[PDB]
C-alpha cells in the first residue's frame, strides 16, 4: 500500500568530462543535483574497468575495453557492446532503461548513439 | 573480532563514522579514498592476527624457539 | 623486350580537379630578427 | 588379364594457404653452419649456442597459434649477409630477423627488401631493431632496456619475439593491444612519451589494463605519400594486400602463362576465376563483400594507339572485341575490410 | 555423463599404395599418424577376400571379388558393388561412413567414386 520513497538527491563532487580533472569552487567542489550525479557516475564506470582494479565491487565494471584492440568484427560486435552497455548502466538503482541507437563505421574510429533514461 | 574484522565491514563502519552532505555511494570518490585505506587496514588486522600465532610459544619458527631456548 | 607477365597494383585516392586557391593570408610586417618568410602553415606555430 | 582396383584418396580445402606464416631465422654460429626447417616443436640441433636456442624458443610460441613455420639457417658472421640473401632469394619467406644485425646490416636487408618489393614483385617483410628507413615493408621496434621474466633481453631478441608472435596472429585479430604474460619488468614510461613514440611511427610496450601490451600496431614508415593514405600507414592492410597480391601471382604462373592462350574467352575465364577467387576472400572478413572486376579500356585505347587503329567507325565493344596480341589488360575495384581498434561514442 | 574417450592414433608400417611393396626410412617404416593408417587398412581390407585365407577373422574380407570375372550385369552390380563395400569398410571402428557417387562404363574397365568419412 505505501507508495515507495523516492530516490534522494546524489550529492558529490565535480569536474569538466573534458577536463578529467576535479575542479574546486572558491575552494568547495561543485555541488551535483538533479540530472548532474548520474552523468559523473556513467562516466566513472565506463571509464574503467572493475577487473584491472582489485579495490572495486565486483559488480562494478564494464567489459567494452575487451573490445578495444579490434578482436572481433563489428558487425556482431555492435550488439555485443550494446549489451555490454547496457549490462554496465542498469546496475545503478537511479537509472532506470539505456537504449543504444546505432553505430557509425568510418576509418577506425567507430561513433555510436547511446540513451539515458532517469528519473528526475 | 579479527575475523570480523574485513574491508567491508569496516567500509560500512567508516562510511557510517562519516556523515557529511554530499551522498554517499558506490564509486564516489570519497567511497574509493576509504575504500584504500581500509584495504590497508585489512592488511593490518591480519598481521595482528598473526602478532597473536608468533607470540605463543607453542607452534614457533627456527628462530623464535631459538630466542625462547636462549 | 622479352614478353613477360607484369601485374600492377595501384591505389585508388579520389581525384578532384583543384581550382584557384582561396582563403589564404598575405601576412606581410616588418621585424629585424631572422629576416624571411614564415609560410606558418600549421596550427599555433610562432617562430622566434 | 587382371584389372585389380586401385583407389587413391582425394582430399578438398575450401581455403588455399600460399607463402604465409614464413619465418626466415639466420643466425651466427661456426658449429652449425647449415639450413634447418623445423616443423616441429622442440627440435633443437645440438649445434646451436645457448642464445641461438634461445632465440629459437621465443620464435616458438605465438599469441593464438604456433606459427606454421620456422626455418633456420646457420653460417660464420663473416659473409654471412650475402649468403643470407642468396638463401631467401632460394626459398620464399614472410618475415626475417637477424640477431646481430648491425646499421650497416639492416639498411642493407632494408635495401634488398624494398629492391625485391619493387622489381621483382615479391611482397616480404622484415623486423628490424633501429631503422629509420622510408618503407613500409620493414618493422621497426624501437623499445630499449626489454626485460622478459625478470631476464635481460637485447632489442633483436625481443623483436624476433614479437615476429614470432604476429606470425601466429589471425588476420580477424588485430596485434593493437595484444597483452603478454611472459613480459614483466620494463622500465618506467610516462603516457606523452609513449604517445609521442608511438606517432614517430615506432612500436613499444605499455602497461595498461593491467598487463604489458603494445600500444599500436602501424607501420614502420613514417610518411606516407598522399595516395596510400591513412590504412597504408597500418601493417593489417599491406599484409593482406600482400596475401592477396602473392596468391594472384602465384595462381597467374601456374594456369595462365603458357598453358592458357590469349583470347576473348579466355579473358572471360580469367575474369571469372578472379572474381572467384575475390569472393572467397570476402568470405573471410578482410575485405568487403563488395568488388568489381573489369577489363582496363584505356589500355586497350593506348595499346591500339601503340598499334595505330583509327579509334573511329566501330563500336566500343570492338575495343574489347579486338585481339590485345599476346596481352589482357584488367582493373579491379577493392576495399580493405579491416575492423576498428578503438571507438569513441555519444551518449544523451 | 562422461564423454567419449577418443580413439588414440592409430600407428604402423607404412608404403606407397601403387608400389604394394613395405618401404623403410633408414631401417625404420615409416609413421603412420592421423589419415594415414585408414589408408592402409582399407587397402587391405579390400585388396584381400577373408574367404581365401583361413587365418583372418570372419568379419573381415570384402566379397567385391565374386562381381569380378561377370558374374552378373552392371546395373544392378552397381549398387551391390556399393552395399558390399558399405559393408566392408564401415567394420572398422574408426570410419564413420562410406558413400558412393556412381559407375563408369567403358569397355571393360568399371570406373567408380566412392568416399570416405573420417574422424580426425
Same mark, same amino acid.
Given at each position: ?120 | ?70 | ?11 585508388? *585516392?579520389?581525384?578532384? $580537379?583543384?581550382?584557384? &586557391?582561396? @582563403?589564404?593570408? *598575405?601576412?606581410?610586417? $616588418?621585424?629585424?630578427? &631572422?629576416? @624571411? ?5 600549421? $596550427? ?5 | ?348
Amino acid at each position: 500500500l505505501p507508495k515507495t520513497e523516492e530516490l534522494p538527491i546524489f550529492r558529490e563532487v565535480a569536474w569538466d568530462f573534458e577536463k578529467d580533472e576535479p575542479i574546486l569552487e572558491k575552494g568547495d567542489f561543485k555541488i551535483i543535483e538533479k540530472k548532474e550525479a548520474l552523468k559523473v557516475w556513467i562516466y566513472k564506470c565506463i571509464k574503467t574497468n572493475r577487473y584491472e582494479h582489485e579495490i572495486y565491487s565486483l559488480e562494478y565494471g564494464t567489459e567494452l575495453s575487451e573490445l578495444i584492440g579490434q578482436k572481433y568484427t563489428k558487425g556482431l560486435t555492435e550488439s555485443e557492446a550494446s549489451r555490454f552497455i547496457k549490462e554496465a548502466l542498469l546496475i545503478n538503482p537511479y537509472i532506470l532503461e539505456v537504449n543504444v541507437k546505432s553505430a557509425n563505421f568510418n576509418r577506425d574510429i567507430l561513433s555510436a548513439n547511446v540513451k539515458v533514461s532517469t528519473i528526475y | 573480532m579479527y575475523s570480523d574484522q574485513t574491508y567491508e565491514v569496516i567500509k560500512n563502519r567508516t562510511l557510517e563514522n562519516i556523515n557529511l552532505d554530499i551522498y554517499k555511494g558506490e564509486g564516489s570518490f570519497l567511497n574509493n579514498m576509504v575504500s584504500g585505506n581500509n584495504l590497508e587496514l585489512s592488511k593490518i588486522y591480519l598481521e595482528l592476527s598473526k602478532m597473536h600465532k608468533m607470540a605463543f610459544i607453542q607452534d614457533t619458527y627456527n628462530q623464535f624457539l631459538d630466542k625462547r631456548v636462549n | 623486350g622479352l614478353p613477360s607477365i607484369n601485374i600492377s597494383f595501384k591505389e585508388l *585516392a579520389t581525384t578532384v $580537379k583543384e581550382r584557384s &586557391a582561396r @582563403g589564404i593570408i *598575405a601576412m606581410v610586417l $616588418k621585424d629585424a630578427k &631572422a629576416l @624571411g618568410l614564415n609560410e606558418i602553415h600549421e $596550427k599555433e606555430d610562432i617562430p622566434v | 588379364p587382371s584389372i585389380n582396383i586401385s583407389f587413391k584418396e582425394l582430399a578438398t580445402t575450401v581455403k588455399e594457404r600460399s607463402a604465409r606464416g614464413i619465418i626466415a631465422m639466420v643466425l651466427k654460429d661456426a658449429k652449425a653452419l647449415g639450413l634447418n626447417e623445423i616443423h616441429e616443436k622442440e627440435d633443437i640441433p645440438v649445434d646451436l649456442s645457448a642464445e641461438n636456442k634461445e632465440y629459437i624458443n621465443l620464435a616458438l610460441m605465438g599469441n593464438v597459434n604456433t606459427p606454421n613455420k620456422l626455418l633456420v639457417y646457420v653460417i660464420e658472421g663473416e659473409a654471412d649477409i650475402q649468403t643470407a640473401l642468396d638463401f631467401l632469394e632460394t626459398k620464399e619467406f614472410n618475415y626475417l630477423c637477424m640477431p646481430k644485425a648491425v646499421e650497416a646490416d639492416k639498411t642493407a636487408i632494408k635495401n634488398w627488401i624494398i629492391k625485391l618489393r619493387d622489381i621483382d614483385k615479391v611482397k616480404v617483410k622484415a623486423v628490424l631493431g633501429k631503422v629509420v628507413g622510408n618503407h613500409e615493408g620493414i618493422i621497426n621496434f624501437t623499445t630499449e632496456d626489454v626485460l622478459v621474466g625478470e631476464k635481460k633481453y637485447s632489442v633483436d631478441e625481443f623483436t624476433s619475439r614479437v615476429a614470432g608472435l604476429i606470425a601466429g596472429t589471425p588476420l580477424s585479430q588485430s596485434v593493437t593491444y595484444t597483452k603478454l604474460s611472459d613480459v614483466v619488468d620494463i622500465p618506467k614510461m610516462t603516457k606523452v612519451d609513449a604517445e609521442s613514440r608511438v606517432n614517430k611511427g615506432e612500436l613499444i610496450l605499455i602497461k595498461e589494463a593491467g598487463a604489458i601490451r603494445i600500444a599500436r600496431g602501424v607501420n614502420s614508415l613514417t610518411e606516407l605519400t598522399a595516395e596510400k593514405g591513412e590504412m597504408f600507414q597500418k601493417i593489417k592492410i599491406v599484409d593482406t594486400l600482400d596475401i592477396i597480391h602473392s596468391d594472384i601471382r602465384k595462381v597467374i604462373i601456374d594456369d595462365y602463362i603458357g598453358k592458357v592462350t590469349n583470347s576473348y574467352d579466355n579473358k572471360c575465364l580469367l575474369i571469372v576465376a578472379i572474381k572467384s577467387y575475390l569472393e572467397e576472400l570476402e568470405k573471410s572478413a578482410l575485405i568487403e563483400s563488395d568488388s568489381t572486376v573489369e577489363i582496363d579500356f584505356e589500355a586497350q585505347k593506348s595499346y591500339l594507339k601503340s598499334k595505330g587503329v583509327d579509334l573511329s567507325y566501330m563500336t566500343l565493344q570492338e575495343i574489347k572485341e579486338a585481339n590485345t596480341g599476346s596481352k589482357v589488360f584488367l582493373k579491379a575495384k577493392i576495399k580493405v575490410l579491416d575492423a576498428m581498434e578503438d571507438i569513441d561514442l555519444s551518449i544523451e
